[PDB]
Amino acid sequence: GPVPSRARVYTDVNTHRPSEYWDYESHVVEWGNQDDYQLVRKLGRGKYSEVFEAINITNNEKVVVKILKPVKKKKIKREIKILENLRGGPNIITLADIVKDPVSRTPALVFEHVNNTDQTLTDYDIRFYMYEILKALDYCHSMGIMHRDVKPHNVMIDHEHRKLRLIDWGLAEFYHPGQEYNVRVASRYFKGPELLVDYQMYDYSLDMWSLGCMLASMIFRKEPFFHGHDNYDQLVRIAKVLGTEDLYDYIDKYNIELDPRFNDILGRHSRKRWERFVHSENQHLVSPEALDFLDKLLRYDHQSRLTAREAMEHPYFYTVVK
Ligand SMILES: NCCc1ccc(Cl)c(Cl)c1
Ligand SMILES: NCCc1ccc(Cl)c(Cl)c1
Ligand SMILES: NCCc1ccc(Cl)c(Cl)c1
Ligand SMILES: NCCc1ccc(Cl)c(Cl)c1
Ligand SMILES: NCCc1ccc(Cl)c(Cl)c1
Ligand SMILES: NCCc1ccc(Cl)c(Cl)c1
């Protein structure tokens, strides 16, 4: 069987908290009043959600309303409990209310309003915003929660106010050491190698891999950086950059049973130098410190990646106010 693993940090946060903190199935959800709100306009949609700008008619404040198709009720309870536990954390979206349609029983989450800013980014801007995301991740990991869906669309930035919010906690989960989790999390391009090789005993370090994918796409102007066309191909795209030598050493370290399908597609690939991705169009965003930081996030071995707190101490952030 596979070798067990434990987070290097915040290992026992949930172990030392009462069950009311992490037992989301027992959480008593209390509805607010859907009549306090009026929908203004549709902002976007997902397979099981619709997002609207709305106004709270009792105080004239704008809000964002996420209407959920309740296909998996336990999942909605988990998102609500996590949002309540994390409320007030640095750069964590604030859940303002929870309402239900009086006839269809469709639930809706009400968030603080955020004016999302859709080439003008400087090296300094990337360092600044990357540090704000790290504050959010160090906070949620310190609270015993893995986000598990870190990606650009889940990072809202109001650039005029230099305001950042980490959103969509629908895939977030409580970290319990030794627990085996579902690997069918995160968006394809941001999935860590642990998910792709079906290593279930993962932890907060998954979010640090996803953060590394975002950094690579920003500094190299290549969106997404690892462009897989399915979950198997996703690992091949990673292997084409990090090389196959370090991938095979990772699988052996954790005694992972690698799917036989990888034999026909993985091949043999050299370790590429991060400098290979630098071009005239992206050189203004790359520096030795940026590449050193990227190299310390994008590691196959989940235990070897920087933690959010270690990442915050990297020289890449020496130019930002802590
Ligand atoms: N009447 C169903 C649509 C809907 C959903 C959520 C809210 Cl908060 C509102 Cl006002 C309206
Ligand atoms: N996973 C949420 C993606 C997302 C982000 C921002 C907006 Cl405004 C919308 Cl509609 C949807
Ligand atoms: N939706 C904003 C995505 C994003 C994520 C990280 C950074 Cl550093 C930036 Cl500039 C932008
Ligand atoms: N996707 C769930 C979280 C979420 C989605 C979109 C927006 Cl605009 C906000 Cl505030 C929050
Ligand atoms: N400091 C970024 C510009 C630059 C110049 C030369 C090289 Cl080889 C690289 Cl990777 C990057
Ligand atoms: N990575 C391809 C070679 C290369 C390396 C560094 C720079 Cl700055 C350029 Cl333009 C081109």
Q: Is 125 annotated as catalytic?
A: no
**Cα separation of 108 and 101, whole Å?**
8
Token digits for 233?
């191909």
Resolution stated for this PDB structure, in Å: 1.7
Ligand closest to 50 (CA) is 2
| CA torsion through residues 291, 292, 294, 295, sign | positive
State the binding site.
43-51, 66
Write the single-letter amino acid at 79.
E
Q: Which of 168, 169, 187 to mutate to test the pocket of ligand 2 (most atoms within 8 A of CB)?
A: 168
281: nearest Cα among 149, 172, 152, 119:
119
Q: Atom 2 in ligand 4: which residue has the minimum CA distance?
A: 168
HEC per residue, the chain:
CCCCCCCCCCCCCCCCCCHHHHCHHHCCCCCCCHHHEEEEEEEEECCCEEEEEEEECCCCEEEEEEEECCCCHHHHHHHHHHHHHHCCCCCECCEEEEEECCCCCCEEEEEECCCCCCCCCCHHHHHHHHHHHHHHHHHHHHCCEECCCCCHHHEEEEHHHCEEEECCCCCCEECCCCCCCCCCCCCHHHCCHHHHCCCCCCCCHHHHHHHHHHHHHHHHCCCCCCCCCCHHHHHHHHHHHHCHHHHHHHHHHCCCCCCHHHHHCCCCCCCCCHHHHCCCCCHHHCCHHHHHHHHHHCCCCHHHCCCHHHHHCCHHHCCCCC
| CB-CB contact of 297 with 211 (8 Å) | yes
Token digits for 49?
């959600």
Distances (CA, A) of 89 to 62, 64, 247, 321: 21, 19, 35, 18
Classify burial at 118, counting beta carbons within 10 Å of its beta carbon; exposed 0-12, middle 13-18, buried 19 or more: exposed
- Domains detected in the chain: 5-22+114-322 (1.10.510.10), 23-113 (3.30.200.20)
CA triplet 18, 22, 25: central angle to 5 degrees?
A: 115
Residue with tokens 């536990």: 85
Q: What does the buried/exposed string (b/e) look like for 72-94 if buried means 16 or more CB atoms within 10 Å of the residue's CB? A: eeeebbbbbbbbebbeebebbbb
Query: How far, in Å, from the CA of 219 to the mean position of ligand 1?
Result: 40
49 lines ligand 1 (CB under 6 A): no
275 lines ligand 5 (CB under 6 A): yes
Catalytic residue among 12, 123, 149, 249: 149
Write the single-letter amino acid at 37.
Y
Query: How far, in Å, from the CA of 114 to the mean position of ligand 1?
Result: 19
**Cα separation of 30 and 152, whole Å?**
32
Q: Atom 9 in ligand 2: which residue has the minimum CA distance?
A: 44
Query: How far, in Å, from the CA of 301 to the mean position of ligand 5?
Result: 27
The experimental technique behind this entry is X-ray
Token digits for 186?
């995160």
196 lines ligand 4 (CB under 6 A): no
Query: How far, in Å, from the CA of 191 to the mean position of ligand 4?
Result: 21
Give φ, ψ of 222 to 5 degrees: -130, 105
**Cα separation of 116 and 102, whole Å?**
30
Residue with tokens 């009462």: 18
